[PDB]
Write an enzyme that holds these catalytic residues in place. Structure first.
Site, PDB file in Angstrom:
ATOM      1  N   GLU A  55       0.866  -1.180   0.000  1.00 22.15           N
ATOM      2  CA  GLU A  55       0.000   0.000   0.000  1.00 22.15           C
ATOM      3  C   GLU A  55       0.906   1.235   0.000  1.00 22.15           C
ATOM      4  OE1 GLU A  55      -3.192  -0.540  -0.216  1.00 22.15           O
ATOM      5  OE2 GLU A  55      -3.272  -2.625   0.506  1.00 22.15           O
ATOM      6  N   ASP A 215      -0.662 -31.591   7.161  1.00 25.96           N
ATOM      7  CA  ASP A 215      -0.756 -32.582   6.100  1.00 25.96           C
ATOM      8  C   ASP A 215      -0.289 -33.939   6.600  1.00 25.96           C
ATOM      9  OD1 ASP A 215      -1.111 -33.536   3.405  1.00 25.96           O
ATOM     10  OD2 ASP A 215       1.082 -33.446   3.199  1.00 25.96           O
ATOM     11  N   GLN A 222       9.644 -24.420   2.050  1.00 23.51           N
ATOM     12  CA  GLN A 222       8.883 -23.771   0.991  1.00 23.51           C
ATOM     13  C   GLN A 222       8.786 -22.255   1.135  1.00 23.51           C
ATOM     14  OE1 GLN A 222       4.472 -24.491   2.107  1.00 23.51           O
ATOM     15  NE2 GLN A 222       5.487 -26.364   2.800  1.00 23.51           N
ATOM     16  N   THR A 226       1.840 -13.329  -0.545  1.00 23.91           N
ATOM     17  CA  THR A 226       0.441 -12.919  -0.571  1.00 23.91           C
ATOM     18  C   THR A 226       0.335 -11.510  -1.138  1.00 23.91           C
ATOM     19  OG1 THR A 226      -0.169 -14.272   1.362  1.00 23.91           O
ATOM     20  CG2 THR A 226      -1.588 -12.388   0.843  1.00 23.91           C
ATOM     21  N   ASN A 227      -0.513 -11.351  -2.145  1.00 28.57           N
ATOM     22  CA  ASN A 227      -0.718 -10.058  -2.791  1.00 28.57           C
ATOM     23  C   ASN A 227      -1.866  -9.278  -2.136  1.00 28.57           C
ATOM     24  OD1 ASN A 227      -2.262  -8.459  -5.206  1.00 28.57           O
ATOM     25  ND2 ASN A 227      -0.047  -8.524  -5.612  1.00 28.57           N
ATOM     26  N   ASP A 230      -5.652  -4.236  -3.870  1.00 26.71           N
ATOM     27  CA  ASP A 230      -5.915  -2.808  -3.918  1.00 26.71           C
ATOM     28  C   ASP A 230      -4.625  -2.008  -4.112  1.00 26.71           C
ATOM     29  OD1 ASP A 230      -5.082  -3.360  -1.231  1.00 26.71           O
ATOM     30  OD2 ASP A 230      -6.014  -1.481  -0.577  1.00 26.71           O
ATOM     31  N   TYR A 275     -10.269 -21.502  -4.568  1.00 29.80           N
ATOM     32  CA  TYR A 275      -9.886 -22.795  -5.120  1.00 29.80           C
ATOM     33  C   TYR A 275     -10.542 -23.062  -6.462  1.00 29.80           C
ATOM     34  CZ  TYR A 275      -7.539 -23.638  -0.721  1.00 29.80           C
ATOM     35  OH  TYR A 275      -6.674 -23.536   0.340  1.00 29.80           O
ATOM     36  N   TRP A 298      -9.910 -10.145  -1.813  1.00 29.00           N
ATOM     37  CA  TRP A 298      -8.960  -9.730  -0.787  1.00 29.00           C
ATOM     38  C   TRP A 298      -7.504 -10.080  -1.062  1.00 29.00           C
ATOM     39  CZ3 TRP A 298     -10.414  -6.131   2.495  1.00 29.00           C
ATOM     40  CH2 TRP A 298      -9.527  -5.776   3.529  1.00 29.00           C
ATOM     41  N   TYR A 299      -7.269 -11.085  -1.896  1.00 24.25           N
ATOM     42  CA  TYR A 299      -5.903 -11.478  -2.200  1.00 24.25           C
ATOM     43  C   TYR A 299      -5.813 -12.616  -3.193  1.00 24.25           C
ATOM     44  CZ  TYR A 299      -7.005 -15.496   0.814  1.00 24.25           C
ATOM     45  OH  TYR A 299      -7.619 -16.615   1.344  1.00 24.25           O
ATOM     46  N   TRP A 611       1.330   6.758   4.217  1.00 21.87           N
ATOM     47  CA  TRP A 611       0.205   6.874   3.299  1.00 21.87           C
ATOM     48  C   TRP A 611      -0.645   8.113   3.578  1.00 21.87           C
ATOM     49  CZ3 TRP A 611      -4.967   7.079   4.431  1.00 21.87           C
ATOM     50  CH2 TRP A 611      -5.390   6.615   5.689  1.00 21.87           C
TER      51      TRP A 611
END
Ligand SMILES: OC[C@H]1O[C@@H](S[C@H]2[C@H](O)[C@@H](O)[C@H](O[C@H]3[C@H](O)[C@@H](O)[C@H](S[C@H]4[C@H](O)[C@@H](O)[C@H](O[C@H]5[C@H](O)[C@@H](O)[C@H](S[C@H]6[C@H](O)[C@@H](O)[C@H](O[C@H]7[C@H](O)[C@@H](O)[C@H](S[C@H]8[C@H](O)[C@@H](O)[C@H](O)O[C@@H]8CO)O[C@@H]7CO)O[C@@H]6CO)O[C@@H]5CO)O[C@@H]4CO)O[C@@H]3CO)O[C@@H]2CO)[C@H](O)[C@@H](O)[C@@H]1O
Ligand SMILES: [Ca+2]
Ligand SMILES: [Ca+2]
Ligand SMILES: [Cl-]
Length: 629
Positions: A55, A215, A222, A226-227, A230, A275, A298-299, A611
């Site tokens: 942002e 799992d 790994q 996360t994008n 906005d 998904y 949201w992402y 901001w």
């Protein structure tokens, strides 16, 4: 040459720009990255003042673009993009092709349920639950010749305060980190900061991985990012203006336009259900575009193996009106200079523009404010939507999309950030849909602005909602939603929101000719300049009512799970927010904050949010250009 601008407001923009870029003020790190705020003791969206967000980077772009407009110098704008690409968009080394190239568009990721309380995590992966097909990956790899994604990760530990370093070296800066992972009830105070690149070197036996996902096998080393849609959309918005203002002066920002266009191409991943389940029929796996809601969700996120080759990508099922950007969609779908190289890039954005405007209208309350949004995954587990719940293309209405601690739509800020984009669209195209939305919204907010005799002012701060919008019927259109009402709980003087509000009213007034909006926008700008200016920009004293959580918020840790943060802090059941961030005790403001809590008082702070300062600067510039006299 560019049209003449109002001298008074242009000078105010230049003054703010100088204060923001002033090395002695400390808004940027040594590497040129802007911090979330000058002050380090800061907990809001991020939990430390010197981390940065995508942002912030997009606001930095907007600021430099405006500087180019008034100075004729765009080297600063190109530099903001250079810093962004180098530090917030994962490089080849951060998202290795070896893994990204093994991505399977027919099996994007493995289903994992979402829970309404952090104590339910880790969430178990279930390979038997259906996952749809990704229809755009082939478009992107063919267009750009790579499997890597070109989007900004949303948060960055600029000076490596947490100690994860770069790709687990624990010493380099900046450091890619993430926080939120455990559902709608995990607030900023309840997270366990983790590295995006997890080689099991920090944290527990398998890093931080088994705190979130569970799992059958052993957790593999790994990476994951996360994008924040906005933010990336605002980058496109800002770059469009930079391009327009550059050309008016015989200058060019071609290289930056190309990056913005590529980013907007990849941003389409936010158009899909988490998904890839069919929109309106969540139990069924999508066959492609039938899984696209065409809204800025949201992402979107992605990750892959470090010591093994595999990757995954997910979109998001939850949509909030506050994240929409009709202007960016108009740019990417209509301007030839910003047309994505992918086969369907421009056309998908064309569909998004139309879908987004329907979304805003469907959510407009009886009074005029915009309601929360909708989701294609009830309770984040694709459960049945309760009977009687209003829908939008099959998606159920949700008052506070994505998060509830506190409610995602209880803050006035979402109203201005988002409507500001609708105002830019209306101004540039005169679009009737945007007009209808703004006429009613502007009438509502103009009646909620309060100016005091001493030059101070107040605007809505905390808001609440009652009822729901009527089910959306594309051919019927806006019903007026007589049963959807907004309620202003209290007022405040948030300078960032006030600036965004002034911006919105300025664009609207310029196009509609509404004098009420124009003078209110000017009074806000004047009031802030004359009554809240300081050596570092603008500020005011504000109460930090949630700061008690520093000491009393317990952080959930799975039974039998033990680990350590880079600095040695032990992570185990029973720890509080401060227990896994002990370095905070060395902060200059720490003793003052704790002293206030001990005396049973609400801590107060005078914050300089990057901001907010940029918002105010840009608002002055916008007024200067649209009202030269
Ligand atoms: O090894 C064996 C075997 O392996 C295979 S390969 C195999 C791998 O092994 C396996 O690991 C892999 O697993 C994958 C899996 O397939 C994927 O499906 C998942 S997807 C996952 C994703 O990674 C993750 O990132 C995602 O996280 C989500 C969460 O789910 C979601 O809950 C949250 S919501 C969150 C928001 O995002 C925040 O923005 C918001 O923040 C709020 C805050 O809450 C609020 O307090 C404040 S309030 C604030 C205002 O902000 C401010 O303006 C105002 O002024 O003040 C107020 C007051 O302060 O606002 C904030 C916002 O501003 O908070 C909410 C709540 O948390 O979002 C995150 C997004 O990141 O979850 C997904 C799952 O659900 O990933 C797995 C990776 O581990 O699978 C592989 C196969 O597929 C191999 O093939 C074999 O060979 C081998 O044998
Ligand atoms: Ca909570
Ligand atoms: Ca309610
Ligand atoms: Cl903030």
């Amino acid at each position: 040459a560019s049209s003449p601008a109002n001298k008074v407001y242009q000078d105010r923009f230049e003054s703010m720009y100088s204060k923001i870029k002033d090395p002695a003020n400390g808004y940027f790190s040594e590497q040129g990255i802007p911090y979330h705020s000058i002050e380090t003791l800061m907990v809001q969206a991020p939990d430390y003042g010197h981390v940065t967000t995508s942002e912030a980077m997009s606001y930095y772009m907007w600021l430099e673009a405006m500087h180019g407009r008034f100075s004729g110098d765009f080297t600063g704008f190109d530099k903001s993009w250079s810093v962004t690409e180098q530090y917030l968009i994962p490089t080849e080394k951060d998202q290795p092709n070896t893994s990204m190239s093994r991505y399977d568009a027919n099996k994007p990721a493995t289903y994992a349920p979402e829970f309404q309380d952090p104590s339910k995590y880790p969430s178990p992966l279930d390979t038997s639950q259906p996952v749809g097909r990704d229809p755009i990956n082939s478009q992107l790899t063919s267009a750009y010749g790579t499997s890597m994604l070109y989007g900004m990760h949303w948060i960055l530990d600029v000076d490596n305060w947490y100690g994860f370093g770069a790709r687990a070296d624990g010493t380099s800066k900046p450091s890619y980190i993430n926080t939120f992972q455990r559902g709608e009830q995990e607030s900023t105070w309840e997270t366990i900061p983790q590295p995006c690149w997890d080689e099991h070197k920090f944290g527990g036996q398998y890093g931080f991985l088994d705190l979130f996902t569970k799992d059958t096998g052993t957790p593999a080393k790994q990476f994951k990012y996360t994008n924040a849609p906005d933010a990336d959309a605002r980058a496109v918005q800002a770059t469009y203006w930079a391009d327009q203002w550059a050309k008016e002066q015989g200058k060019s920002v071609s290289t930056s336009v190309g990056k913005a266009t590529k980013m907007g191409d990849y941003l389409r991943y936010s158009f899909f259900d988490k998904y890839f389940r069919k929109i309106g029929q969540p139990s069924q796996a999508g066959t492609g575009y039938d899984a696209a809601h065409y809204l800025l969700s949201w992402y979107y996120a992605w990750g892959g193996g470090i010591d093994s080759t595999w990757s995954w990508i997910i979109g998001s099922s939850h949509n909030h009106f506050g994240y929409q950007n009709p202007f960016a969609a108009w740019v990417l779908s209509t301007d030839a200079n910003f047309k994505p190289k992918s086969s369907n890039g421009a056309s998908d954005w064309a569909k998004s523009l139309d879908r987004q405007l329907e979304f805003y209208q469907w959510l407009q309350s009886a009074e005029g404010a915009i309601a929360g949004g909708a989701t294609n995954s009830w309770n984040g587990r694709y459960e049945a939507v309760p009977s009687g719940t209003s829908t939008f293309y099959g998606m159920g209405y949700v008052e506070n999309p994505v998060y509830a601690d506190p409610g995602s739509n209880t803050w006035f800020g979402m109203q201005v950030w988002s409507m500001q984009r609708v105002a830019e669209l209306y101004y540039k195209t005169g679009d009737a849909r945007a007009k209808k939305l703004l006429d009613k919204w502007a009438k509502w907010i103009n009646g909620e602005i309060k100016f005091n005799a001493d030059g101070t002012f107040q605007i809505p701060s905390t808001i609440d909602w009652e009822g729901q919008p009527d089910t959306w019927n594309p051919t019927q259109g806006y019903t007026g939603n007589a049963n959807l009402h907004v309620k202003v709980v209290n007022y405040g003087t948030d300078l960032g929101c006030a600036s965004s509000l002034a911006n919105t009213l300025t664009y609207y007034a310029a196009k509609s000719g509404d004098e009420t909006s124009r003078q209110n926008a000017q009074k806000l700008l004047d009031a802030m300049w004359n009554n809240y200016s300081d050596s570092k920009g603008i500020s005011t004293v504000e109460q930090r009512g949630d700061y008690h959580r520093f000491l009393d918020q317990e952080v959930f840790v799975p039974a039998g799970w033990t680990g350590k943060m880079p600095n040695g802090d032990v992570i185990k059941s029973g720890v509080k927010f401060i227990d896994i961030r002990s370095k905070y005790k060395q902060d200059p403001e720490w003793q003052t904050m704790v002293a206030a809590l001990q005396a049973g008082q609400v801590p107060t702070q005078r914050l300089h949010r990057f901001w907010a300062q940029s918002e105010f600067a840009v608002a002055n510039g916008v007024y200067a250009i649209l009202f030269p006299d």
